[PDB]
């Protein structure tokens, strides 16, 4: 059977890859794959709503083997680091949220080591002395989404998946899509995973797909020749600080309701620099190498949108908002199953399209 995946960010690429891994034939339609939210994304993979939590822990459990399998097929690196994740808090408010977080994670078998202010500074010398304590998640990490999507693209190629670099301009009642150049592509199944543009595809029957509203996020990248920070760090007052091996240090992110605007603004960059310098005062001399902005794919109730629509053979896989890099593997596994079996794995039932 043949599945057409509309949109090729981290969510359609992963989905398309796993569909191939399950012996399906796959076409991905996207004029510029891995160019949007997935391009600017930080790739923090923090452990962290019961249903969503369960979805995240499953994706978490799966991440290591997902990456292993992907590198094997692709002969490429996905840039997955498992050096643990440091949660650092700097005031009463934030130190209390850590207690809540640690209590939320103990029952579920997630390694979480509480750290007092001192222990925090020993794990990360570059933290400001105002640090009040933290949590260490030694089994967690972070990925470089740019490397992850590059691998997904390589793997999809190796397995003979087709990539069409054109815009899907219309959905056709088997299902298919019209492309901007006039050519058409039908398949046995169609999967929409076009981020915050999913619901904007002309020809979708009213009510089929809910509004995947964009949530803007500005983000920046600093650099030093040698890495500045020891490991993926969350500093709460939340700012995400993700060191790459080559000296890049990602700093995200703003969360904003600005429709589809992706302008990098004085306000946003000032917000981010303010946070990083408050908790990493030595970051003052790091080079500001990049500033960017992307759109998170939302949903009317803030949770992912996975499974069948009321339109036969039309599925969706979107609305991962703040954590799609994190949810990418489980989403891929889940949609694989759905396509092959016709049934919806238990862990995904909460995110059916029909709930609206």
Ligand X SMILES: Cc1cc2nc3c(=O)[nH]c(=O)nc-3n(C[C@H](O)[C@H](O)[C@H](O)COP(=O)(O)OP(=O)(O)OC[C@H]3O[C@@H](n4cnc5c(N)ncnc54)[C@H](O)[C@@H]3O)c2cc1C
Asked if 277 and 284 touch (Cβ cutoff 8 Å), the reply is yes
First to last CA, the chain: 30
Closest CA to 193 of 340, 11, 41: 11
Residues 200-239: x where in contact with ligand X by CB under 6 A, - otherwise, as a string:
-x---------------x-x--------------------
Please name which of 308, 329, 319, 34 lies closest in space to residue 198, comparing C-alpha atoms. Answer: 319
- Contacts with its own copies, residue ranges (CB under 8 A): 222, 263-267, 269-270, 273-274, 276-277, 283-288, 291
Which segments are annotated as binding site for FAD? 11, 30, 37-38, 41-44, 168, 321, 324-326
| Cβ proximity to ligand X, 195 vs 307, nearer residue | 195
Q: Which residue in 73, 325, 347, 353 binds ligand X (CB under 6 A)?
A: 325
Minimum separation from the CB atom of position 269 to ligand X (A):
12
The two tokens of residue 208 are 């089929």
| C-beta separation of 228 from 126 below 8 A | yes
Which residue among 296, 299, 303, 307 contacts ligand X (CB under 6 A)?
A: 296
Closer CB to ligand X, residue 131 or residue 164?
Answer: 164
153 near ligand X, judged by CB under 6 A: no
Q: Contact, 290 vs 220, CB < 8 A?
A: yes
The residues with which 288 forms a beta bridge, in sequence order, are: 222
Output the smallest distance, CB 232 to its own copies, in A. Answer: 19
Binder of residue 33, out of its own copies, ligand X, none (CB less than 5 to 8 A by kind): ligand X
What's the min distance (Å) between Cβ of 124 and its own copies? 17
Nearer to its own copies, 262 or 344 (CB): 262
Q: With respect to ligand X, which residue has the nearer C-beta, 119 or 238?
A: 238
Taking the C-alpha atoms of residue 282 and residue 239, their distance in angstroms, rounded to an integer, is 16
CA separation for the pair 141, 139 (Å, rounded): 7
Tallying the residues shown for the chain, one arrives at 356
Which of its own copies, ligand X, none does residue 35 bind (CB under 5 to 8 Å by kind)?
A: ligand X
CB of residue 37 to ligand X, shortest distance in Å = 3
Provide the β-strand partners of residue 116: 133
Q: Tell me whether residue 94 or residue 326 sits nearer to ligand X (CB atom).
A: 326
Residue 129 Cβ vs ligand X, minimum distance, rounded to whole Å: 26
Which of ligand X, its own copies, none does 273 bind, CB closer than 5 to 8 A by kind?
its own copies
Max distance between CA atoms of the chain, in angstroms, equals 63
Listed in sequence order, the residues at least 6 apart from 316 whose beta carbon sits closer than 8 Å to its beta carbon are: 191, 192, 193, 198, 209, 305, 306, 307, 309, 353
Q: Which residues contact 304 (CB under 8 A, 6 or more apart)?
A: 52, 55, 318, 319, 320, 321, 327, 331, 351
Q: Is 10 in the site for ligand X (CB under 6 A)?
A: yes
* Binding span for ligand X by CB under 6 A among 1-9, 73-81, 280-288, 348-356: 1-9
- By CB under 6 A, name the one of 38, 76, 144, 299 that touches ligand X: 38
Tell how far CA 273 is from the center of its chain.
Answer: 23
Q: Which residues bind ligand X (CB under 6 A)?
A: 6-12, 29-38, 40-44, 167-168, 193-195, 197, 201, 217, 219, 240, 252-253, 294, 296-297, 318, 320-326
């Amino acid at each position: 059977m043949h599945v057409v995946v509309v949109g090729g960010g981290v969510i359609g690429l992963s989905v398309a890859w796993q569909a191939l891994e399950r012996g399906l034939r796959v076409t991905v339609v996207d004029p510029e794959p891995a160019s949007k939210a997935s391009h600017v994304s930080a790739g923090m993979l923090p452990a962290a709503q019961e249903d969503l939590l369960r979805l995240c822990l499953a994706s978490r459990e799966r991440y290591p083997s997902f990456v292993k399998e992907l590198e094997a097929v692709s002969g490429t690196s996905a840039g997955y680091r498992r050096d643990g994740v440091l949660d650092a808090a700097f005031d009463d408010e934030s130190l209390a949220a850590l207690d809540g977080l640690r209590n939320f994670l103990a029952p579920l078998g997630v390694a979480v080591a509480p750290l007092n202010a001192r222990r925090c500074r020993e794990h990360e010398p570059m933290l400001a002395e105002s640090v009040r304590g933290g949590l260490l998640g030694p089994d967690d990490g972070a990925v470089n989404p740019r490397e992850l999507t590059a691998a997904l693209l390589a793997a999809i190629d190796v397995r003979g998946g087709t990539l069409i670099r054109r815009r899907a301009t219309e959905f056709l009642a088997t299902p298919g899509v019209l492309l901007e150049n006039g050519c058409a592509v039908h398949g046995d199944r169609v999967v929409l995973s076009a981020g915050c543009w999913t619901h904007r595809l002309a020809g979708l029957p009213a009510g089929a797909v809910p509004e995947i509203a964009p949530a803007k996020g500005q983000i920046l990248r600093l650099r030093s020749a040698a890495p500045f920070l020891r490991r993926a760090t969350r500093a709460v007052t939340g700012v995400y600080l993700v060191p790459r091996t080559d000296g890049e240090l990602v700093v995200g992110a703003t969360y904003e309701e600005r429709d589809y605007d992706t302008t990098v603004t004085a306000g946003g960059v000032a917000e981010l620099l303010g946070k990083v310098l408050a908790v990493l005062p030595g970051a003052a001399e790091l080079e500001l190498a990049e500033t960017a902005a992307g759109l998170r794919p939302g949903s009317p109730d803030g949770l992912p949108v996975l499974g069948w629509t009321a339109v036969p053979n039309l599925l969706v896989a979107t609305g991962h908002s703040r954590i799609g890099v994190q949810l990418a593997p489980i989403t891929a596994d889940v949609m694989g199953e759905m396509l092959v079996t016709g049934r919806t794995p238990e862990v995904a039932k909460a995110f059916a399209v029909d709930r609206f």
